[model samples]
Target: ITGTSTVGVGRGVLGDQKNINTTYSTYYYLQDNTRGNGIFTYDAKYRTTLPGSLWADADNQFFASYDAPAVDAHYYAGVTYDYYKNVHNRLSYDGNNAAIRSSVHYSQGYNNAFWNGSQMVYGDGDGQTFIPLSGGIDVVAHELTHAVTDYTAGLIYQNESGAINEAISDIFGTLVEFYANKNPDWEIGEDVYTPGISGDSLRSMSDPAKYGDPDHYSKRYTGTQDNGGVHINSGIINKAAYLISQGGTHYGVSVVGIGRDKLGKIFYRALTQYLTPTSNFSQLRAAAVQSATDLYGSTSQEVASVKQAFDAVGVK
Candidate 1:
């Protein structure tokens, strides 16, 4: 859609008000042209479809409860885009300023969200389980990071490689959450998950075992469920990443916190320059070590902490 770019105010699923970028051709559309090429959000209309209808408004004021998901999806996509561009200097998911697109309200009572290789899709959960998934910044960034992973590492989504892929998404997702400065924490899906219950989240990067996810490699799930436990086994890598950034003792291993910025740089470097489609846990360790070495030095504490974080998680 061609139009003059503008900003619109909207209330999100969480009842938080935020300004969203939009385009006005004939009607106000959720097509943000501010960050990169554009961030386009659609209304799935409770149906299973890809990139459904472009969300349009009459007054450019999105306050209706029905408009909450699209508001967050469009605004948060721009936030994720800004994260990648400002922090990592990457243009977009493809590093080419590729347009970002998303669809909300997918299916009746759909309880999850995902990246469909081409664009993003969010579900309006059954209320008790989740609200609108796009309401969670971490969830939004997690799915968008999948797009980044596909464009960069191209990590295979199976077994250990799949776990790595999932961890990368979680890692960058958490980073994006912190980047947004929105009640930042090392937890995933805390905001939009279990609105009926508090102090609970879908996953915990700081302590993955609290949700039955393996924080140590030795306890990793080897079963076939979840694509060889991709989401479950991601805890091992997620813990390692947490240790790398925040530093803590696990088992008998202790890692000196290198903070989030360096963790992001090292991992981004590894993902873009070193990681391959088949890279496993050990291979990921090697890539992180090499990445830290390249950015810091062979004997730098950054490199040492990378080694310690992996060891702490029993990745070796």
Candidate 2:
């Protein structure tokens, strides 16, 4: 929708107030034209539709209980867009300034979020396990990262390759979390997972074992379930990324800290340049090392940490 760009104040799912980019044609709509082609957020309205309707507001101030999810989805998508553009020097997910889109309040008591090739979809939780998924910046960034991977790595979503895809999303999601400079942690979905519980998250990159996920390739799940345990096995690569960013010793191997910026640089380079649709764990390690070697010399600490991080995770 073409209109004058505007800013509107709103409270997110967690009651945190933030300014969101909006558009005003006849009425205010959740269409932000500040970045790329534009960011258009829709309202699923408790239905299982793709992109229901562009969220419209009689008043620009969004504060209704039902509006929380849309506010967060629109606001967080902006933040994720900014993160990719400023941190990675990439324009949007496709590196071509493609328009970003999202929809919130999908279905009754839906508790998940995903990138559906064309746009993002968010679920309003049943109120026990999760609240609104878009409330979590990491969650929003993680979904957007999938779009980036789809355009770059094109890794198939199954088995080891799928695990790598999941891990990449988690890795860059954490990076985006840190880049936003909020209360950053090595956890994913903590903001939106279990509103009653304190100090817990859906997954922990620093310690995947906290959720019974394998931090070592030797313990990877080989079952056919979960598309070969894509979500479960991602812990191995997630732990490796955590080790590279924050120095740690695991299973007799140690990795020197390379900081989040360098870690992101290496991973982004590898994902875009080296990874393929069928790349496996060993191939990911090689790609990371080669990425580090390309940006930072082969003898650089960046390269060394990349090697040690994979080694610490029991990946060859």
Across residues 1-316, which tens digit of lDDT does each residue of candidate 2 receive? Answer: 9889999989999898999999999899999999999999999989998799999998899999989999998988889999888878899999999999999989989989999888999999999999989999999999999999999999999999999999999998898899888899999999999999999999999999999999999999999999999999999999999999999899999899999999999999999999999999999999999999999999999999999999998999
**Model 1 stretches astray by more than 4 angstroms:** none
Tell me the RMSD of model 2 versus the true structure.
0.7
lDDT of 1 at 294: 97
Each model's lDDT comes to 0.94, 0.94
Q: To one decimal, what is the Cα RMSD in angstroms of model 1 from the true structure?
A: 0.7
List the lowest-lDDT window of 10 residues for candidate 2: 80-89
Cα RMSD (angstroms) for every candidate in the order listed: 0.7, 0.7
lDDT of 1 by residue, 163-280 (tens): 9999999999999999999799999999899998999999999999999999998899989999999999999999999999999999989999999999999999999999999999
TM-scores, all candidates, are: 0.99, 0.99
In model 2, state the lDDT of residue 235. 99
Give me candidate 1's TM-score against the actual structure: 0.99
- Superposed Cα deviation of residue 304, candidate 1 (Å): 0.5
Total colliding residue pairs, candidate 1:
0
